[PDB]
Amino acid sequence: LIPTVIETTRAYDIYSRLLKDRIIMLGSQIDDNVANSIVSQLLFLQAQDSEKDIYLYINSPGGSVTAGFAIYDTIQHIKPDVQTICIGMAASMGSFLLAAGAKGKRFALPNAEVMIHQPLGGAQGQATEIEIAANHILKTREKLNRILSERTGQSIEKIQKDTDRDNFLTAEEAKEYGLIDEVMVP
Amino acid sequence: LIPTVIETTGERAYDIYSRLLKDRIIMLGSQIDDNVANSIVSQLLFLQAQDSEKDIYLYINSPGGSVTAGFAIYDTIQHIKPDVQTICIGMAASMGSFLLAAGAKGKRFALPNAEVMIHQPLGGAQGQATEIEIAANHILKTREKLNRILSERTGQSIEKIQKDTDRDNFLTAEEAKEYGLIDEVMVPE
Amino acid sequence: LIPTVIETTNRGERAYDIYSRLLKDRIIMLGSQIDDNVANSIVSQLLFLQAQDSEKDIYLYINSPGGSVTAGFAIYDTIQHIKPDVQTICIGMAASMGSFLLAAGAKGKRFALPNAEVMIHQPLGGAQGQATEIEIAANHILKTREKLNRILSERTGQSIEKIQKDTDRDNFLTAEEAKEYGLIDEVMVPE
Amino acid sequence: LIPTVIETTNRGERAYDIYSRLLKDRIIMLGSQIDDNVANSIVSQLLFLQAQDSEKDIYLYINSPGGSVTAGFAIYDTIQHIKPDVQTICIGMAASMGSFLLAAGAKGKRFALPNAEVMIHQPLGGAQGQATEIEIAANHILKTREKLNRILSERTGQSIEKIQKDTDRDNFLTAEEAKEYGLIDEVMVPE
Amino acid sequence: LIPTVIETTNGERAYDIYSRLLKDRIIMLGSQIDDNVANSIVSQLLFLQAQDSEKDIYLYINSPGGSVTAGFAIYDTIQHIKPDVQTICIGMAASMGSFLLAAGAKGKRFALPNAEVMIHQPLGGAQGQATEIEIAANHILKTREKLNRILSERTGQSIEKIQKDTDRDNFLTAEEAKEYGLIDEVMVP
Amino acid sequence: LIPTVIETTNGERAYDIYSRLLKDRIIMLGSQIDDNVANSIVSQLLFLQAQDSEKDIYLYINSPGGSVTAGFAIYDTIQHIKPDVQTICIGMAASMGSFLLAAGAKGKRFALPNAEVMIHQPLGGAQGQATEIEIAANHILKTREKLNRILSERTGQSIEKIQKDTDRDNFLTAEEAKEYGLIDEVMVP
Amino acid sequence: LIPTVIETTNRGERAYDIYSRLLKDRIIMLGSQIDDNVANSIVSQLLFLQAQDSEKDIYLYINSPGGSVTAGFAIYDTIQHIKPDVQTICIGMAASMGSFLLAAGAKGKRFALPNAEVMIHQPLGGAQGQATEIEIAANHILKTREKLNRILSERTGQSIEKIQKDTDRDNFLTAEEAKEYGLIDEVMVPE
Amino acid sequence: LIPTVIETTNRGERAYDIYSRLLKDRIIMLGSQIDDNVANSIVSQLLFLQAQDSEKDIYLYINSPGGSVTAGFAIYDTIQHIKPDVQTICIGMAASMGSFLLAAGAKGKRFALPNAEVMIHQPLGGAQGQATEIEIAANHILKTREKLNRILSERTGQSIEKIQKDTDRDNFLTAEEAKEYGLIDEVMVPE
Ligand SMILES: CCCC/C=C/C(=O)N[C@@H](Cc1cc(F)cc(F)c1)C(=O)N[C@H]1COC(=O)[C@@H]2C[C@@H](C)CN2C(=O)[C@H](C)NC(=O)[C@@H]2CCCCN2C(=O)[C@@H]2CCCN2C1=O
Ligand SMILES: CCCC/C=C/C(=O)N[C@@H](Cc1cc(F)cc(F)c1)C(=O)N[C@H]1COC(=O)[C@@H]2C[C@@H](C)CN2C(=O)[C@H](C)NC(=O)[C@@H]2CCCCN2C(=O)[C@@H]2CCCN2C1=O
Ligand SMILES: CCCC/C=C/C(=O)N[C@@H](Cc1cc(F)cc(F)c1)C(=O)N[C@H]1COC(=O)[C@@H]2C[C@@H](C)CN2C(=O)[C@H](C)NC(=O)[C@@H]2CCCCN2C(=O)[C@@H]2CCCN2C1=O
Ligand SMILES: CCCC/C=C/C(=O)N[C@@H](Cc1cc(F)cc(F)c1)C(=O)N[C@H]1COC(=O)[C@@H]2C[C@@H](C)CN2C(=O)[C@H](C)NC(=O)[C@@H]2CCCCN2C(=O)[C@@H]2CCCN2C1=O
Ligand SMILES: CCCC/C=C/C(=O)N[C@@H](Cc1cc(F)cc(F)c1)C(=O)N[C@H]1COC(=O)[C@@H]2C[C@@H](C)CN2C(=O)[C@H](C)NC(=O)[C@@H]2CCCCN2C(=O)[C@@H]2CCCN2C1=O
Ligand SMILES: CCCC/C=C/C(=O)N[C@@H](Cc1cc(F)cc(F)c1)C(=O)N[C@H]1COC(=O)[C@@H]2C[C@@H](C)CN2C(=O)[C@H](C)NC(=O)[C@@H]2CCCCN2C(=O)[C@@H]2CCCN2C1=O
Ligand SMILES: CCCC/C=C/C(=O)N[C@@H](Cc1cc(F)cc(F)c1)C(=O)N[C@H]1COC(=O)[C@@H]2C[C@@H](C)CN2C(=O)[C@H](C)NC(=O)[C@@H]2CCCCN2C(=O)[C@@H]2CCCN2C1=O
Ligand SMILES: CCCC/C=C/C(=O)N[C@@H](Cc1cc(F)cc(F)c1)C(=O)N[C@H]1COC(=O)[C@@H]2C[C@@H](C)CN2C(=O)[C@H](C)NC(=O)[C@@H]2CCCCN2C(=O)[C@@H]2CCCN2C1=O
């Protein structure tokens, strides 16, 4: 399953060994369980050293918006720069969090994919209940577009237009858009 | 389970519902879907073709169902020349109560222990925010359309109907009369 | 699954399903669970027989575990509305709305066969969701119960209080006990 | 899949399904599990056959595993109520409520074929819920067993005590054993 | 997909194929034997005796058997009625099917050259208390003793031999079934 | 996949990330509230008081709520213990989650700038007799009156306003929740 | 997912799961549905705590919907058997057998938190089969209700008659209502 | 789900699961449905404790609905084989093979707590297939029942005839009734 590594100076699972050097893996669908683990890792690493950079590695299709905002707010709240690196795919809220990294320190590997889209949801019941859920999800999208605007340097209007459908971007296209700063080269 | 009857006028065999239709009675006694709506519409148009002067009688024991199917029946009632009397037996709920109130003025009835339920329309939305936005706007406009027509038929204000249909509202025959959904409570002869 | 019978008169030979044959002699069979389809059949049959003859008695044979309350009331109100006396006969079992409709027959003309069972209960329902939604559903079924007890009081000669108490749990009765209660007038004596 | 028979008749040549053809000669088939649908069919048939002729015998052929007790009593009460003698013939198997209805035939006219099976047992039921609810259903099914045993005592000539002991578990009886018991009167001999 | 056949009269008359065969006193036992099948076969046997008490009846058997009690309903009706019941096996007569094949009128039990015959012991089951399992065992054992007793009388084989021969499934050719005493003749073109 | 963290001592000690946080008096309420979650949270609150009756406890909330009774187990333990319980909403505090957020020590209830807060009425159900439905309705209504009473005291809003505001699902931004009285401060970097 | 606590102790620094840590101070958690597994765990814990110290009080925290009656009586009988006083604290909810065990605590030492719920009701069960089998299960669960009511009478100071009426249907009680009833002794005040 | 306890001696600090801790003091928990896995655990525990000390008593605590007969007999024969007295204590419920094993404990040393239930019954099984296959299965379960009744006769002081009659249906007993029967010697009086 998950391999064990030995350091001379104990036994670590590979993910915990990376955390010792301030690397956090976001490598799954974002639910509350994932979000609370990332949050706790971010807070622990600040408590260890308030000044040294943190590195968030992202291979995620996204998931829950609220779970993603738990991570987003914790990134912005803490003193250290949180560097972000896209490996494989950062989609939806995973791409949102890729863009959330410290300005100048957001990366994607050359063949990594980035996807931007509008939030997904649903409601079943009375017209009033459907009205509430529609107004809530539209306000959630407004909140997402506004932050992405500030993050990428693109206008709210352009982001609305470009996320209307699923938008698949190359690592190059992600830089051009302003979702990342550099394509990390071999 | 559907019984057969014999008439003496030669002689002919009828299923009970076809026999009532002979005397211009239409039965709306199930969940309102497309099949039911198209049946009732065809029945209403046939009875007008036979006689455009004589009254038609729509007996209602229905939990409602599809709003558009209900509206297909509604629009046919209003288009045709004959007065369509409505009679609530057992229960008229949702689109069933809407169609009960759609009967010719002075000619909407309910039996003493019949129940009338009014409610807001039900639906669903899946997918993207804009897809949910369209679905929400559609069902809200559908409700506006329902509330407007009900207002005109009952005499009640649009907002009172908005308030009284927000949650499921169960009314007795007397309460439905007082509300303006019907005109008379049909008492034993 | 229903047998066919052949009938002979001035008009000749006619084939009937057995239930349609009984209907020709003003007998309606209430022999299933009560839903909207059954109710609408009964209602249509009651109205047809009044149109045929508004003086002659109608006969409702009941072998039913009840079912839908609103469906039963569609039958109930139709019985009361039409001019002819509607006799009721319990064969086998009249439970729930079945027993309500048995008590609904014309006074003096309600019967049960010596080994027929009669069951009386309170109405059954359900609610899932918000506290307000549950309140409304509770209030509806309580008012439905009030209506059932009020009518049953008139037909039996018992108080609403006694009916409330006796219907709190499922209450099974013999034919004799149903007669003593006022649900029926007579136990039908064999030949 | 049931066959159609053509018979030359007085009014004219006629096509019947075979079960309806048998009904013409006053034979009713009880050949399935006893539910409310089956019971109401049998009741209608017995009432139709009395209306045609109040004097001539009726013949009820039984190949049934039983089923519903109340549905069985709808058939029982109708048999006893009508004037004509109802003969009972067990073909294949009469079990549970099937065996009860076999025993219910007019005295001297209850038959089983040589290799036919008769099974007698106590009522089956259930209750799930509160202790009060389980008490009611237990008391109800126990009174139902008393009613069945008391009638069986009258019909077979055996004591309630003996029937109680003999029906505690499933009891399979041969045709000759059914005769000795008093469930039937005669084993039907090849003509 | 049961085909309709037409026959001329001094006009014309339509039959489904099976009802047409019954007119010439042929009963088809061509399915698994349950109570529904048994009561149908029993009624046909009784009807055909009523039409003619003298002329032979013909039972055509392509059945894998089924219910034992349903089988005995048919068996006892065959024995009761006065007409001779000829039995013809086409395809397969298994279990209670083969029992009823052997029950045909003496000298009048047939099987087609490639038709198969299977004899076996009765199948059943019980689940519950030891007392319940004992009763169900004693019942099925007595049923087997009843089957073996009659098969002995029909075949000429001893009760002990049939017990041995039916312990497991025994498949017989048409010639073997003749030799055994289950049939009298193999029917040749 | 809960990561292990290592800390130096005058040797070394391993912690799962959540147990490490508890050492500094942080309790994570980051799942649906059931009895298992409640008893875990209750035990942590009681343990931390036992360690130090003076120092603050910190409850971090990312919960969609769940059970009301399980929620009140946590609520009553917060009130009982002497230490001030600070509440911080990350991501979402919904239903009983938002109730427990509002239950934090006065002046010490927080939410992050993009964290969402949802208030609603309690959910339930009953299926059976009218008597059974009445009891279950009266019980859930009384539970709501209990929730609204406490929320009134915590927020400053009237019992009547909260009733109106929780009739349907009400989604609040971190700023709106502050203004409402559910939290005291929006936590800024 | 349950947290691990590190505590400095006399023998040395030690890692505990939080529930085992509480047990060290003589606290047992009853925080799930009561089945045989839960019951045997509680029994073992109560016996272990007597063995360590026969004099010092034990504390049973209850957040339980109830469950099995026999499993509940394994816990009840062990509480009464041991020498130490067993204090009971209702946190969140004590329902059915949960409320019974709350009432079972040493007199003067039964508590509920201000917003904690207490529910009392009659036993739940079932039977499916013969009339004899249903009789046995009905008589068994009725005797079980008598046993529970008789003990509750002793514990709360109310009559068997009152308990019978009050537990017929589900009865939800506030902490203060539980105190007036005598199920608990005290509502636990914020310190 | 099982709590951990820390123990102190000459050998220091040791952490135990609560059931392993009880086993150190020669207590075996029989607190589940009896299958082969449970039986093999009990058998291994019994043999280990004899190896440790062949004089000191062993204690078997029983909270069990029974299960497999052969599994129970593996435990039974192991109890009888080993030299130490094996005391039995019924907590909550000993039903079926659970009650058999309760009666299996050393004479004079079988206990039940005042509210513990004891149930006795006949063994349960099934058979599907040929008449010969059903006969064999019937004969096996009947002989299994003979063996159970014969042993229960010795341990209780009742006749095989009385045991056969009393075990025909599910028979529930109080602790006192179990003592009167000879299944246990003593009802365990509280402190
Ligand atoms: C090994 C474990 C280390 C745990 C680190 C937790 C931490 O840094 N929490 C953030 C809040 C937070 C939680 C979250 F989930 C997501 C976020 F983005 C942010 C925090 O408040 N940090 C404080 C320092 O720690 C605290 O002061 C105390 C004890 C610490 C164990 C827990 N605490 C708090 O949670 C409270 C809420 N924080 C405060 O009391 C102080 C003062 C009030 C405003 C919040 N706060 C601070 O903001 C303090 C002073 C400003 C610096 N300042 C922290 O860094
Ligand atoms: C025995 C079968 C009788 C069927 C009756 C159909 C009928 O009355 N249709 C309505 C339209 C309609 C359909 C529906 F589904 C729901 C509705 F509410 C209304 C109708 O058009 N009625 C006409 C009479 O019939 C028609 O003229 C012709 C032939 C008739 C067989 C079918 N037709 C039409 O469907 C068309 C659409 N109608 C017309 O052609 C004429 C002229 C154009 C406007 C519609 N129309 C009429 O309105 C005529 C005007 C003369 C009065 N005027 C009807 O009653
Ligand atoms: C061969 C088919 C015969 C169908 C018989 C229907 C019938 O008797 N309906 C009841 C209403 C009713 C329906 C129901 F479902 C359950 C009920 F309990 C009662 C009825 O109204 N009966 C009338 C006679 O019939 C009617 O006058 C006309 C035509 C008849 C085919 C249909 N109609 C009505 O449905 C309307 C509603 N009835 C009336 O218009 C008249 C006058 C307004 C009050 C109701 N009404 C009558 O009550 C008339 C005069 C009083 C006698 N009086 C009926 O018996
Ligand atoms: C071809 C259609 C034939 C229909 C025959 C029905 C019939 O005979 N019902 C039994 C009752 C009954 C029903 C049942 F389901 C199971 C039973 F066991 C018994 C019956 O009452 N028979 C009467 C004759 O018929 C009736 O008098 C009238 C009309 C008949 C169509 C229907 N009716 C009744 O149902 C009513 C209830 N019966 C009566 O009115 C008379 C007088 C009141 C007591 C019952 N009753 C009779 O008992 C009459 C006189 C005594 C002879 N006496 C019948 O045989
Ligand atoms: C077109 C429809 C033709 C229907 C043929 C029915 C018939 O033949 N029944 C067998 C009994 C039987 C039923 C069954 F399901 C399986 C069997 F194997 C046998 C019968 O009894 N046949 C009698 C003639 O018919 C009857 O006498 C009367 C009317 C007939 C419509 C029905 N009945 C009987 O069912 C009764 C039971 N039979 C009798 O009453 C007489 C006298 C009592 C003993 C039986 N029985 C006869 O055995 C009579 C006299 C001996 C000749 N004898 C029949 O052939
Ligand atoms: C490392 C483990 C720490 C365990 C902490 C348990 C604790 O604080 N329990 C609360 C009760 C409680 C339980 C719960 F689940 C939710 C709650 F909100 C509250 C408690 O009672 N605390 C006492 C101190 O502890 C106790 O006195 C004893 C031993 C402690 C191990 C367990 N006990 C009790 O549970 C009993 C019930 N408490 C008391 O006996 C005393 C006196 C009676 C009233 C309750 N009580 C107190 O309230 C005492 C005195 C007031 C201070 N006062 C506690 O702080
Ligand atoms: C750390 C491990 C501690 C284990 C403690 C078990 C224990 O106390 N069992 C209770 C019985 C019991 C079990 C149960 F599950 C629920 C209950 F309610 C009660 C018990 O009997 N306690 C004894 C002390 O322990 C025992 O004497 C011996 C060894 C102990 C390891 C196990 N034993 C017993 O189980 C036997 C049955 N008990 C006895 O032998 C003595 C004498 C016979 C009557 C029972 N008994 C006692 O009752 C002794 C003397 C009275 C005090 N008296 C205990 O407290
Ligand atoms: C620390 C592990 C201790 C394991 C204890 C096993 C044990 O006591 N087995 C019983 C057999 C048995 C197994 C079982 F599953 C359920 C039972 F009820 C009984 C046993 O045989 N016990 C012997 C002692 O042990 C043995 O001698 C040897 C080694 C022991 C590790 C295993 N063995 C046996 O299994 C064999 C079968 N036993 C014997 O060989 C001797 C001689 C042949 C007859 C059986 N037997 C004994 O009966 C010996 C001498 C009499 C005393 N006598 C045991 O107590």
Numbering used by the authors:
A (entry chain C): 3 to 11, 16 to 192
B (entry chain G): 3 to 11, 14 to 193
C (entry chain F), D (entry chain E), G (entry chain E), H (entry chain F): 3 to 193
E (entry chain D), F (entry chain D): 3 to 12, 14 to 192
List sentences quoted exactly from the publication behind this structure.
In its active tetradecameric conformation, ClpP forms the central proteolytic compartment of a larger AAA+ protease machine. Two rings of seven ClpP monomers stack and interact to form a secluded barrel‐shaped tetradecamer harbouring the 14 catalytic sites. For protein degradation, Clp‐ATPases are required (in Firmicutes ClpX, ClpC, and ClpE) to unfold designated substrates and thread them through the entrance pores.
To increase our understanding of the interaction between ADEP and its target in S. aureus, we also determined the crystal structure of ADEP4, a particularly potent ADEP congener, bound to S. aureus ClpP. While typical features of ADEP‐bound ClpP structures from other organisms can also be found here, a specific feature of this SaClpP:ADEP4 structure are the well resolved N‐terminal β‐hairpin loops lining the axial pores. Here, in contrast, residues 4 to 10 and 16 to 20 are well defined in all seven subunits. D27 is in the direct vicinity of the outermost end of the aliphatic tail of ADEP4, corroborating a previous observation of Mabanglo and co‐workers where the corresponding E. coli ClpP residue E40 formed a hydrophobic interaction with the tail of bound ADEP1.33 Binding of ADEP initiates rotations at the key residues of the hydrogen network. The rigidity of the nonpolar side chain of ADEP4 induces a reorientation of the hydrophilic D27 carboxylate, which is the terminal amino acid of helix α1. As illustrated in the enlarged section, this tilt causes a marginal twist of helix α1, thereby shifting the guanidino group of R23 by two angstroms. This generated molecular switch ultimately leads to rearrangements of the unconstrained axial loop stabilising the open gate. When ADEP binds, it stabilises the upwards pointing β‐hairpin conformation.
